[PDB]
Design a protein around this ligand. Sequence first.
Ligand code: 4QD
Length: 371
Amino acid sequence: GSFVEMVDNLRGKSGQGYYVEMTVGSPPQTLNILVDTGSSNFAVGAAPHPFLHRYYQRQLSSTYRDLRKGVYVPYTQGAWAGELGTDLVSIPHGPNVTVRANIAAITESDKFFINGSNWEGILGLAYAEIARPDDSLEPFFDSLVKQTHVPNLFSLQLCGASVGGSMIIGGIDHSLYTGSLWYTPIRREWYYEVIIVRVEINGQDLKMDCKEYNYDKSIVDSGTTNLRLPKKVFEAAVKSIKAASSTEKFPDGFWLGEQLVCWQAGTTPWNIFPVISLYLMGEVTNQSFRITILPQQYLRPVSQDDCYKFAISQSSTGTVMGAVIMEGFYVVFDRARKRIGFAVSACHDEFRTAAVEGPFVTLDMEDCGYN
Ligand SMILES: C[C@@H](CN)Oc1cccc(CN2CCC3(CC2)C(NC2CCCCC2)=NC(=O)N3c2cccc(F)c2)c1
């Protein structure tokens, strides 16, 4: 247990993301920061906002250096605008180091911050290629590795339903997982891009061309709540999940995330819903492994009734393995060896468990990738 002080350093609210404490500036200003492997900017709320309990006050930080350049980050669901600068940054429940990092001071935003989420900023852990304004703005993790001896790796244990978890920086904590860690290559260093080679619903192959699973990319994203699937894959997966859960019928809108279904406290029939398996490309020629998720992961909780939302949704920008997928596992972002590791999380029911299994023989896996 050498990484013991980093265990349980994450907090959150169901479907509102996981956040870590980060200390910025001099004297110290500690804020709650969203852990986001799907973006590459370190950015903090820097002006009052109704959804913010606290914000970064640059005038109070003697070490703050204004880069005198604006930054704008737009997404489909929201956006933010701010000012670029650099300041001293430490993670009190993270590595024992202090770095000078790029920081975007968010002055205006639209549908970005979440009311009651308890976080005031975002830590983009992906690579420089997708940083804004461009790839010359060094991401936080790159600054960390360049300025210190911290090994070029981090790992995440996101615990599902108030939520908690651990972000281990510079290593792997063996108390956070059971069984073996199975690695999939990082195809390209921009998002944490991976290759899905096969999909099963209750052991039944979806039988789609594997190029469709990765069209136009498949990413591992701690900042996205859902498992997001390309339209054609989503349609086939829903059709298969509906057929496997036919002991009870649900309205069409439930599968589209438009309708919620609620059950009396402790009566959710988890047993009627299928398990879902995603096969990932392994580290050896023709070898793959699979990660299996339970309905406890893909039906997320939103009194006497437990309300759930179907947390598999459609995408037009590739597959997104969000918190739905990550919650069943201990996930290792091995940047040094360009690979992502999965193991069963130390954080299910009496009949089934999330699993990481292999090896399997899968031929022509290279044909599954989009070019
Ligand atoms: C925790 C999550 C719960 N919905 O809320 C947030 C809020 C802010 C940021 C993030 C991280 N994160 C920011 C980026 C994200 C996902 C979540 C996105 N990513 C795409 C990029 C292209 C490839 C596929 C993935 N598209 C969106 O519209 N997003 C978004 C979602 C919600 C709000 C938003 F402003 C942007 C998540």
